[PDB]
Amino acid sequence: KHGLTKDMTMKYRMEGCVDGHKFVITGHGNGSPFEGKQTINLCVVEGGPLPFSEDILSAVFNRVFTDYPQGMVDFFKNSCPAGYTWQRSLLFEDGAVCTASADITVSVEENCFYHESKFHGVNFPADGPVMKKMTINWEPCCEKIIPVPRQGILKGDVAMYLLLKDGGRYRCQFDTVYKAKTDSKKMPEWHFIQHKLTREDRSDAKNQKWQLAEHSVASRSALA
Amino acid sequence: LSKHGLTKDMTMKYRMEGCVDGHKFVITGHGNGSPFEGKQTINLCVVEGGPLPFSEDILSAVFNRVFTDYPQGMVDFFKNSCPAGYTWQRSLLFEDGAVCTASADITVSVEENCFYHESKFHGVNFPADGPVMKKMTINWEPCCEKIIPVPRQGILKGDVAMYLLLKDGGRYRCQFDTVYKAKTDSKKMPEWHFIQHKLTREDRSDAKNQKWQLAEHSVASRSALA
Amino acid sequence: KHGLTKDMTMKYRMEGCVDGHKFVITGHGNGSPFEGKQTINLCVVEGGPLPFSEDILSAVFNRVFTDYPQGMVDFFKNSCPAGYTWQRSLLFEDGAVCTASADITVSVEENCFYHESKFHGVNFPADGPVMKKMTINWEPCCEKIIPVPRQGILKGDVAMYLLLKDGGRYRCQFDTVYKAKTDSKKMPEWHFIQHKLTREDRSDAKNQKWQLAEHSVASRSALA
Amino acid sequence: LSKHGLTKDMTMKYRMEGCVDGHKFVITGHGNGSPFEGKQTINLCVVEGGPLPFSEDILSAVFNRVFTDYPQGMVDFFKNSCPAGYTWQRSLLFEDGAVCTASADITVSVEENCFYHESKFHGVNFPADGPVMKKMTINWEPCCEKIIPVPRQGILKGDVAMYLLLKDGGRYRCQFDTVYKAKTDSKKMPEWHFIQHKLTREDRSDAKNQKWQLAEHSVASRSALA
Secondary structure: OOOOOOOEEEEEEEEEEEOOEEEEEEEEEEEEHHHOEEEEEEEEEEOOOOOOOHHHHHHHOOOOOOEOOOOOOOHHHHHOOOOEEEEEEEEEOOOOEEEEEEEEEEEOOOOEEEEEEEEEEEOOOOOOOOOOOOEEEEOOEEEEEEEEHHHOEEEEEEEEEEEEOOOOEEEEEEEEEEEEOOOOOOOOOOEEEEEEEEEEEOOOOOOOEEEEEEEEEEEOOOOO | OHHHOOOOOEEEEEEEEEEEOOEEEEEEEEEEEEHHHOEEEEEEEEEEOOOOOOOHHHHHHHOOOOOOEOOOOOOOHHHHOOOOOEEEEEEEEEOOOOEEEEEEEEEEEOOOOEEEEEEEEEEEOOOOOOOOOOOOEEEEOOEEEEEEEEOOOOEEEEEEEEEEEEOOOOEEEEEEEEEEEEOOOOOOOOOOEEEEEEEEEEEOOOOOOOEEEEEEEEEEEOOOOO | OOOOOOOEEEEEEEEEEEOOEEEEEEEEEEEEHHHOEEEEEEEEEEOOOOOOOHHHHHHHOOOOOOEOOOOOOOHHHHHOOOOEEEEEEEEEOOOOEEEEEEEEEEEOOOOEEEEEEEEEEEOOOOOOOOOOOOEEEEOOEEEEEEEEHHHOEEEEEEEEEEEEOOOOEEEEEEEEEEEEOOOOOOOOOOEEEEEEEEEEEOOOOOOOEEEEEEEEEEEOOOOO | OHHHOOOOOEEEEEEEEEEEOOEEEEEEEEEEEEHHHOEEEEEEEEEEOOOOOOOHHHHHHHOOOOOOEOOOOOOOHHHHOOOOOEEEEEEEEEOOOOEEEEEEEEEEEOOOOEEEEEEEEEEEOOOOOOOOOOOOEEEEOOEEEEEEEEOOOOEEEEEEEEEEEEOOOOEEEEEEEEEEEEOOOOOOOOOOEEEEEEEEEEEOOOOOOOEEEEEEEEEEEOOOOO
16 A cells, blocks of 8 residues: 555666765665665766765665554655655764755656655765775664654654774764655654665676665664 | 672662762762663762752763673673673763763672762753753653774773653753773673663652652663664 | 956856755855955845745855955965865754855956855754744854865864844854865965855845855964 | 952962863962963972873863953953852863863952962763874964853853864864853953964973973954954
8 A cells, every 4th residue: 555565666866966076876776665675776877986985875765665563653654655855964973064865756657766866975084984985884773763743754863884994983973854745644653763774886897886775674662 | 600790689889979060969879770681770869969950860871781681692791891890981962062971980899799880970061041950851762872892992882862851742862972991801892782771760859858769771682684 | 366356256156955945046246355355146046935044055155255464375366267166064053954065266358256056955943043034144253274285175164153033143063175176386374264244135026135245354363 | 440359460279170081180280370461371280190191281271261361342251250250161072072071160369369270170082092092282273262142141152163283293173162150240241252362281290290381372352354
């Protein structure tokens, strides 16, 4: 129901700019919304190769792909098929700052998600891990999701870590606001979503490209 | 297995010396709990400087990760450090610019089956019109703290964005960053993990003293994703 | 010299997005680079009226307009006529985050500045002063300017305040990186720039528009 | 005009109690300066807990805005509070996540022509490999602090992004946020303004004690733009 089926496809377009370097990424995906599982295949269409680590972009590419237990309000599935939008700041530990946003829609006819995104990054230091391309993946995490009932929005809060080639970690604070396109009659209570997001490089002579895989699962506090 | 010097049911004694915006105070107390269950109850009294002009909830998380239920198969850094115990240091950055520093030293007296917990707390710049100075805070919301090993140094770091829930139904955010150190060298270090916590306060003050009870339940876990 | 004259003109284009609301601003200006004085006339061409305070945008519209004392290296005038670029994060006290960047060029032939800018803002609270349009002006300030000699860039650091209708103030941290297009042989030592920037609303039935005026003056520490 | 209880040339005495990552210490000292010139020299000795395992520069700005040259025509909040004096509270957020809180109480003994300065300092989470624990800091760079009145409450707030300059020619940032309170009610409040500061340290330690001299020159100003 909700324009959703067990197995679905996705189409992506991101327009971005990081320290003045413009780029465009397009892509396609498949996954299973009720399992909170997705696979995403991206290609740098303009501005490639990227002079910064592509890992900074990965979490911009849809909380409809979350496994919500029975009994928990699913704000994101409830927003479908019209969809939902989000806005996020990324505050990195070395003073780099990004802003990101996206618009998610379901084409029922087509059993497809259309995802349009924007990304703006400033002040990545020249010899930092993003510009030296020393990143490998984000570490799995636990995001806290908070309702703001008076406004019909959710906020998310997670302290993320990007794992580095030498074994270190590079921290980034994510702060997100999530809004349905049509204000739903039901709001969840606060909860967690755990996430694991991985990148596999698929780049060839012609184009820079890669595959992301995500698994996300919502839960309540484990303490009675 | 006995080597930690711990038992199923134990007691604790507390002393805290603090200062929040120039107001000096001393808190003492006693507790009981079950360290392998990650459960404790703590009874505190303001023995100098009472009544406090700021919300006592800013203090609550100062009062012992030996009281965490660690699943088998995870390395328990804290109980591994017993009975000598461990120390920690924490920054608290509140959303309205207030800042606190806190530190503590935990030791086990095996003969008394009792923890000795000594702490220090300094806070600055709580706005006169905010929830701490207006005593509008009711409880910390239950949370999920990330714990990260620093194998180079044999310490752990913890990171958690905490929220105090307010009388009016609002929420007030505070970022905790903590460094956890054993008093002697862990042969073993954990992988990164989570600790979920739930910490509650019930006021027990009367005409003689400002007093309150805390209760904590804390449980460690790994990522739920394969 | 440097493609500069005492009296010059400017042309502006900004493409922006703040909490998903797209907009385009164009404009024209006149001022005097050596006096650090400029007047800027802006019009919201797409996306108007703006649903957020326009004051958040004002400091995106050129450090060529700084009065540098004799004896102090002028990184910005030295970059002319090719120009300079900059990237900035704006961290507001209520969790709102913006990223901004711009590209400045001098048309010598035309005695004109071409200024192209981008602005992305997320997470302005609905009942905050930006969305309630409770702002009047930025308070004059003192920015610290620091050289990074190994890289040929400058960083700037200023804690800004937006004055509110009720008499309050709303703080925003500015962190900027400034880069010449052609790496200059000379770098300044650290210094201050003081700035005063004002807005006058010029809006009519057809379009939202306003005028900015800036005066900026560089100095060294006043302590021997 | 005499009402402040100050004179052209005055002395000071200091005591600081502190703790940085569990290392306790006490510093005492003496000073001389000229409060209307905004100039002072301060001589400090580590009397308990020495030698310090962290850079003493993290402490320097703990040691009195009565020592500011205010131009005529500006309201001098600090000298207006004399001779009773004033108090302050400050957060120090360093760029590598270390956090300090500091507070002090300044009083004038008019009979001794001497300031009594009592302070407290708590710091946490300096990385073992950073410049503070490696003693790589040489001096704070001269700065420009914004001072803002809060007329509702009769306090001032100050805001300054400070940088410690390192042996290697690098720089290490620290955000200072301070609240300044007079001990009794200012009939008068300043408009917002700037204070430019220059604070220097020269080590004077020997085989017996860790000791150093600070010197400060601080001058208030208004915006330079019409």
